[PDB]
Each structure stands twice: as C-alpha cells, then as structure tokens.
Amino acid sequence: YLDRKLLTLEDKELGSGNFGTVKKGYYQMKKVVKTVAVKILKNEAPALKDELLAEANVMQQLDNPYIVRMIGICEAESWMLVMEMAELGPLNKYLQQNRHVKDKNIIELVHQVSMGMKYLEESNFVHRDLAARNVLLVTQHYAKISDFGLSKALRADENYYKAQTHGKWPVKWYAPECINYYKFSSKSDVWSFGVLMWEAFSYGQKPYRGMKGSEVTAMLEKGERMGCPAGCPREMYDLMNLCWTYDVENRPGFAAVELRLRNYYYDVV
C-alpha cells in the first residue's frame, strides 16, 4: 500500500463518476515526484471498497504502453487508486473541444487503442467498458486505455465471461451476444471498439443519438448499423462495420483489427 504522507491531492477536482471523484495529485517517489490521477471512493458509510480493490487487482497485472499504469492503492481518509497521470484526459471530451484535430491524428489514437486491446486479448482479460470516455490522452498523439472496474480475467478453459442483469447505460457499446446472453469476450470488446471508433471520428458525439437501448438492439437485429460520421475516412467506417459483425465467430480479433489500422495509418501518412 502507498504512504498517504507522500501523496498530495489537488483540492479542485477533475470529475465525479459512479461513485467518487478523480483528483490530480503528486506522489513522492524514491527521489523525483510523480504526477498522478487519483480515483477517490465516496463512502459516507463496505463493498464499494471491494470494487476498487478488484479494479486495482486487474491493473496490477497489466503492463503495456497503451494502458494506464497503476502506482498503487492508498488507504486513508478515503480509499484511493493512484495512477500515472494522463494529462489531457478523456478522448471523447478532448475531441469535443478540439475539432481541429485531423483524421490522421484520430487514426493514430485509435490505432494505439487497438494495440493495447491486442495486449489485453493476449492476456485473456475482457475490458467490458471499452468506449471513448475510457481512453485517456497523455498527449494529443498518445492514448492509453483506462477504467478496469468492469474488467474480468477469463478462465483458463473459456474465452468468455458470463455476467448477470445489466441496466440501460452500457447497451450502446454492447455486442448482440452481450445483450441476449450476457456473454463477454475479447470479441465483444472488438464490437465496443467499433463503437469507440465511430465516437472518435464523430469528435466525441454520443452513438445512437436519441435512441433507447431497446431501439438500438432492434436496429442491430434488423442488420442496420450507424451511418458514416461526417468527414470520416471511408476505410475507417469499413473497419467499424467489420467490428460490428453480428456473429461472434466471424467477427475479427484485435490482431486483425490492429493490422488494418496500422496499414491504413501508413497509407494516410
């Protein structure tokens, strides 16, 4: 566990989630001080603590340039998950506020995400919340995946995790087998990645605007998909549609997705 006396938190906050705050902080290391982001658990007054610790347990096992690194867990006034700071914050919000960012730049960023998800797939972890809000920018040209609170280490003898009843909020990023069978796999992360790309090339607009989850589900069952974002490169829209392959077996893994991106990034460059 980290030493609370070595951590300073900034009084102003970055955002409030479900349910807690994220604050910027500074953690004194063996000699330099490191800038951190700290997820702080709201707990006016048990098992919310367990959730944060599980989240920490996953991040501890992950080591990759395109995933947020955990520094550690701190037990103090509140329970806290201390991470290396990605200064520019969430990809969706950054693109909302930086429409000047060019298609080539967006391609670079989503490609980096595919590289981190290839690693995750190889480590047999499912993310289960892969969306533009959970990609963070270190700089305008370097993205990392964040938010492992829903993530699961897959059993040695299976390539999916079985959940129970989901609410409405996450539906727009879920593959059909998630909606209907509560089955989560690297292939379901690939589906969510297609939505993440549609988000990124829409400069952080919401997918399926104005539709209820039930309507999204119906649309997908009819073979319909979101249309091409204004200005979006045709080949990136083509890749989105491949990620939205209905049948889990025929949908690509992250190896294949990463190759298509690398190749198109090269073409554009």
Q: Is 148 annotated as a binding residue?
A: no
- The window from 80-88, 108-116, 177-185, 200-208 that contacts ligand 4MG (CB under 6 A) reads 80-88
Q: Is 20 annotated as a binding residue?
A: yes
85 binds ligand 4MG per the rule CB under 6 A: yes
- Out of 25, 67, 89, 152, which residue is the one contacting ligand 4MG (CB under 6 A)? 89
Q: Is 25 annotated as a binding residue?
A: no
Three-state DSSP state, 71:
strand
Tell me if residue 50 is catalytic: no
Spatial CA neighbour of 242 closest among 229, 232, 253, 233: 253
Q: Residues of 182-213 as b/e, b for ≥16 C-beta within 10 angstroms?
A: ebbbbbbbbbbbbbbbbbbbbbbeebbeeeeb
- The window from 14-22, 118-126, 213-221, 234-242 that contacts ligand 4MG (CB under 6 A) reads 14-22
- Out of 56, 70, 80, 147, which residue is the one contacting ligand 4MG (CB under 6 A)? 147
Sequence-ordered alpha helix ranges (H) in the chain: 47-60, 91-96, 103-122, 176-181, 186-201, 213-221, 234-243, 254-268
Q: Are 114 and 193 in contact (CB under 8 A)?
A: yes
Cα-based angle 4, 88, 208 (whole degrees, multiple of 5): 115
Q: Which residue number is nearest to ligand 4MG in terms of Cβ?
A: 89
- The window from 12-20, 166-174, 197-205, 237-245 that contacts ligand 4MG (CB under 6 A) reads 12-20
Rounded least distance, CB 75 to ligand 4MG, Å: 18
Q: Is 22 annotated as a binding residue?
A: yes
150 binds ligand 4MG per the rule CB under 6 A: no
Whole-angstrom distance, CA of residue 189 vs CA of residue 185: 6
- Out of 112, 114, 146, 202, which residue is the one contacting ligand 4MG (CB under 6 A)? 146
Question: Within 13 Å and on the Cβ side, how many CA atoms surround 68?
Answer: 31
| Cβ count near 15 (within 10 Å) | 11
Exactly one of 11, 103, 129, 189 is catalytic; name it: 129
CB nearer to ligand 4MG: pick between 68 and 220: 68
216 binds ligand 4MG per the rule CB under 6 A: no
* Largest distance between two CA atoms of the chain: 59
Rounded least distance, CB 41 to ligand 4MG, Å: 11
Whole-angstrom distance, CA of residue 135 vs CA of residue 117: 11
Whole-angstrom distance, CA of residue 241 vs CA of residue 22: 34
Rounded least distance, CB 193 to ligand 4MG, Å: 16
- Out of 2, 9, 83, 175, which residue is the one contacting ligand 4MG (CB under 6 A)? 83
Return binding residues for ATP: 14-22, 39
Q: What is the binding site for ligand 4MG (CB under 6 A)?
A: 14-15, 17, 22, 37, 39, 68, 83, 85-87, 89-90, 133-134, 136, 146-147
Which of the residues are catalytic? 129
